[PDB]
Every structure is written in C-alpha cells, then in structure tokens.
Amino acid sequence: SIGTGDRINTVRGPITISEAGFTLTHEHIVGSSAGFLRAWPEFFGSRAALMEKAVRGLRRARAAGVRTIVDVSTFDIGRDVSLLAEVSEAADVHIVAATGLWEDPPLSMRLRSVEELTQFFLREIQYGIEDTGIRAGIIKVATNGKATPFQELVLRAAARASLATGVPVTTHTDASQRDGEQQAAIFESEGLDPSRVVIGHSDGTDDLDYLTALAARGYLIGLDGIPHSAIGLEDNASASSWLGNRSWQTRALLIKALIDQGYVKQILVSNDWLFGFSSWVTNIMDVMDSVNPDGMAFIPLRVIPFLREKGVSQETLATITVENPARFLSPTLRA
Amino acid sequence: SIGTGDRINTVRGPITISEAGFTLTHEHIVGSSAGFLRAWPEFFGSRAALMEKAVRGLRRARAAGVRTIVDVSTFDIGRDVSLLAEVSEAADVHIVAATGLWEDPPLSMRLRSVEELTQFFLREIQYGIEDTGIRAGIIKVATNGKATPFQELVLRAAARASLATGVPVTTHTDASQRDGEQQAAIFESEGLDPSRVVIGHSDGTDDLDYLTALAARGYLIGLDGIPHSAIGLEDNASASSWLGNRSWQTRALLIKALIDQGYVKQILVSNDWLFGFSSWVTNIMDVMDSVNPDGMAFIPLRVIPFLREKGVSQETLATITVENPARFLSPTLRA
Numbered sequence A, B: 001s002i003g004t005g006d007r008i009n010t011v012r013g014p015i016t017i018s019e020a021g022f023t024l025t026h027e028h029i030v031g032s033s034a035g036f037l038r039a040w041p042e043f044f045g046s047r048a049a050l051m052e053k054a055v056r057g058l059r060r061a062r063a064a065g066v067r068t069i070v071d072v073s074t075f076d077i078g079r080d081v082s083l084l085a086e087v088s089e090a091a092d093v094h095i096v097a098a099t100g101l102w103e104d105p106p107l108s109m110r111l112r113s114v115e116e117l118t119q120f121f122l123r124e125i126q127y128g129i130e131d132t133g134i135r136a137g138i139i140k141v142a143t144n145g146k147a148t149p150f151q152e153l154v155l156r157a158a159a160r161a162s163l164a165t166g167v168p169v170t171t172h173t174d175a176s177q178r179d180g181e182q183q184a185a186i187f188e189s190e191g192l193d194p195s196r197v198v199i200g201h202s203d204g205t206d207d208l209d210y211l212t213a214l215a216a217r218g219y220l221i222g223l224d225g226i227p228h229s230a231i232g233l234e235d236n237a238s239a240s241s242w243l244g245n246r247s248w249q250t251r252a253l254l255i256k257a258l259i260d261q262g263y264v265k266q267i268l269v270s271n272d273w274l275f276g277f278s279s280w281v282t283n284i285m286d287v288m289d290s291v292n293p294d295g296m297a298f299i300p301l302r303v304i305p306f307l308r309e310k311g312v313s314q315e316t317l318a319t320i321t322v323e324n325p326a327r328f329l330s331p332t333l334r335a
Ligand SMILES: CCOP(=O)(O)Cc1ccc(C)cc1
Pocket: A028, A030, A031, A032, A077, A172, A231, A232, A233, A272, A279, A280, B107
C-alpha cells in the first residue's frame, strides 16, 4: 500500500495488467473546473443526475466490451475522484484517475516552480488525491500551440513525476499546430522515454509527417476524439462546432494509416466523451448526446466494425484496444 | 431559516446588528484558488498549521477590539467555509463569508450568462455554500482596469443578487485606473443603489476627484489595504512589491481626507490581511508577517491611534469601525 510498484492504480485500488481488458485511454466522467461540482451541482441538474447518467453510459460501454476507462480529468478539469469511485463501482468498469494540469490552471498553480509542481503530481500518484487515498495512474498535461512558460514547467514536472514512479504521461495538443514536437523536446530534455508518453488529440490533424515524426521516436499516438471535433476556445461563433470539419470516418482512417506504417503497438484510441460538461457553452450535452447517442460505446460499436470492413484484423484491433493500454499503463521507465 | 430577512449571515449562523461590533470589512483567512487547500494542504505546511495560525491571528485581533471580520474570499479565491466556521468558533470572532467572483474564475464560470451567474450567487446567499448550509453575507466582484466582457456580467449578476436579497456588494479595483467609475455605471444600469456597494482597494490611489466622485453618488469607499500595497500580477520583478511605493500613513490619511469632506458614514477600513497565500509567490507570508507582525490587529493597534493623533475623535472612529459596517451589512435595498 506504499509504493507504485507494477500494478495499475484505479479509483477502487490496484489492478493487474490482465484485469484492465479493453481500455479507453482518453475519457471523462465530467469536464468541469476545480470545486465547481461541489459549489454548483444544480448546473448538472444535480450530482445524483450526473452520477446516474455516467453509470448508464458506462454500463452501455461495458455491454459493448469496455472494461476500463482512463479519466484524464486533472485538478483543473474538476476531477472528483469520489464521484469516479462511486460510478466505477456502480457500473463495474475500472476507472484510472489522472494527476497533472490541463489548460485552465488557477493562479495558485500557475505561480508554482517545476519542483513544487513535481511535488504536487507525486502527491497525487504516490500518496493520494485530496484526503481520499485514491492514487492517480496517469499524468495529464496540455498545450494549445506554443507552450506558455508555465506549461513548459508542467511538462517538465510531469516528466520528473514519471521518471520517479513509472506512471505515464498523456497530452492535450492543438494537433494542427504540431504541438507534440515541442512537447517531445521538453520531455526528452528531462530524460523521459517516449514509450511513457501518448501525444493526444492527434486525430485532430491529417499531417502524417507530424504523426510519423512522433511515432518514429517512440511516442504513442492518441487518436482519442474519433466521434467529435478537436474542440477549443474558438470564441466568436463556437458553440456547436462539435462534429467538426472532418468526419469520424476520416479520423478513424488515421488508425489504419498508422497500422499500415508499422505503428500498431503505438496507437491508442478513444472517444474523449463526457457525461457532464460545464467548461463549454450551456446545453452542449444535448448536442453531444443527439449526435453520438452511443457515447463511450462509439469506439467498440462503430469504429471497430468500420476498421474490420477496411481489412483490419481482430488480432490487430485487440493489440490496439487491450495490449497497448496494458503495456502503456503498467508502471515502468521503458515500455 | 429560509429567507435573508434583516440579521447578518455569518459562517456560524445569523447575528444581530448589535452583535457585529468592531468589524474589519475586507479580510481573508486564506488567499488561494478553488479546490487548492483540499488538493495540496502541504503547500501551507498542513491544513492544521494554517487553521492554528488563523486562530492565533484572529485571537490577537480580538484582543485589540475586533469582533467581526468579513472574509471577502470568493469561490475562485478558494474560500473554504468549513475552515472559516472552525476558525470563527475557535477564535470567538464572527466571520461573514462572501459569494461572487474575483479575478481568477475558471472556464466553468467564465462561460456562464448573467442569469446563470445570478442563480449561482443567489444559491450561496439564500440556500448555502456547497453542502454546508452556510450562507454568504456579501457579494465580491473584481476588475483590474476596463472590465472584461465576463466581468461586466459578474457586476450585473452581483447587482441582481443584491436587489433580490439586500446583501451588499464589495469590489476589487485597480484604483489607479479609476475602475470604480465603470463599476458604478454597470451597477446603476441594473438599478442597484450605491449605498449597497463598497468600492474596494480605494486606498490604492491619492486621486480625491475619483474618490469624491464615487462618494458623492452614495458609494462606500473601501480603504482596505492600509498596511500593504494594492498588489497585482506585475509579472517581471513583482515578488516583494508588498510594502508599496506609498507608506501606510499616506493610505491612512485618506481616511481623514474623506472625514474632512463629510463622508464619515461612507468610509470602511481594513487590512486586507491573510494567514495563507498561495495565489502569489512562494514564501510571501514570511515577508508579510515580518513587515506587519500585527496582522489584522494593524487597524486597531496602529491606524486608530495614528488618526487620534491627527485629531480624529473616538466618536468618529466608532462610526467608521462599528456603525458603518453594521449599516452596510444589514440586508436592505437602501442603507
Ligand atoms: C474536459 C477537457 O476536455 P478536452 O478533451 O481537452 C476537450 C476540451 C474541452 C473544453 C475546452 C475549453 C477545450 C477542449
């Protein structure tokens, strides 16, 4: 009970590699902000309504074959690990929680040094989140174009926490700006092995030069938003820029491109779904649920059959959906 | 137990006007960020260390004559009303908690409409903060120069919540940019009476044209940071720009200027002290405590005697420190 060791931390305790099964590596129960669900639960109808909706969605994902999700909600996404543990137990789906910082850190984080941030990320991996004793199994970081000075520190702190514990790093990018190239430079400057990093939102680009430049160095490629656009604060007239300019089939075909290039063991697929979403326009969930009623079951019910139709084998899809997440999540300095 | 009515809400329940006594109207137990004390209590040594330090400081303030403080920490300052109630009971000092939003709201707040924000502020005044049942007795808002679009909505929502409940509004300004002039315009556009508003950090300027333009319309003037600079994110080489360019005597003399102009009933004085401070550089509390060891007792131990030495009567100082805060805090549409 003291030490990361080799099992994977979930919000209901450690699991073996063989228990993870079919794993969605980039998901959210709720996309929110620190403190917001505790301060304003009625925003979501109620906490009970959100919890019940998440249990129904995870039971639908489980019926389609999902056994684990990685909830990549950080502190500043409003991660509530008590809600994750309740939903995990009710749905009988393992949930891996995250540490790290996304793109909305408050001043009490933004003023911290790289050493202080490393202490905070290590707290959440090695000791517990808040007073719950629940430990993170992944470290989430973010850029949106060139890193801000503080995001460079977050990247470096995530590398240090990974180098101490063997827990991997998952990134948010603006893939259209090729952020993974700067993220890789910063991680490598700290000595992190690329096999401990997934460069996320990588389905937000069709640039195979960018994607293969990352995979060739050993990074995992997170094709993690297949049923929806790589969304961002476009201001002006954003709202339901949800679906995106590109079809889900176009994003899914990147999975086949990377298989065809030899990178089957470096692909991680997901929906980047959520059951509540306060860090966006009001009623965004009506739009999301009308467009993708399968929610987190979209990957197994629609993307897997589509790839089979395109000639990808069941064995190759099991490597992507079962073997890769287990190898990636199992703590190590080199996977 | 349902309804604002006429008593003042504190973190230990309603008090009468006569129970408030000598009141500091702009203070903080902790200056932080939402969720931060729960997620990283070791930043402050521990939660117990911060709590004990706050109890010692409030007992020193009580020994100097203070009976109530108004903790103007919002959601995004990391207000923890359970910590306030614990400290209040241990120190035997009443604490009035705040709703509203300061200058660090997260995306889940910044994307909300004026109606949604009003619902949130009314929740915290009329129902309770989080699941505590503790109700706010004041609404805190902020600008730093020209209002952002979202800060205009916060100002308007604060006015609407005040117009429904009679709870007053307290503002953060960059006084050097005369923000209170735009804040007054926005409040008045919603129908709020100026007697329900204190324009804070007004000791951050020597501009008597600005200060009297506000007082002449009926606003209260918050001379609320006497022992320290009106601090802000100056970046570059901020850190210990704590003391400021102006002396505490220069700020205190604004109190006498406004008395001499006829505005004794519109002055509110405070320290704007805190016992922990994570929304600033590390170890800022060492600097603060070395420079002002009297903490929240600075007003009664140093500013009151200084004003007496300058010819202000004990009766005039009781109006400022006892009568004005009771009249201001007691819920009403017109004070
Ligand atoms: C909840 C975090 O979700 P995400 O996967 O980064 C998608 C996302 C949500 C909200 C904003 C402002 C940008 C992007």
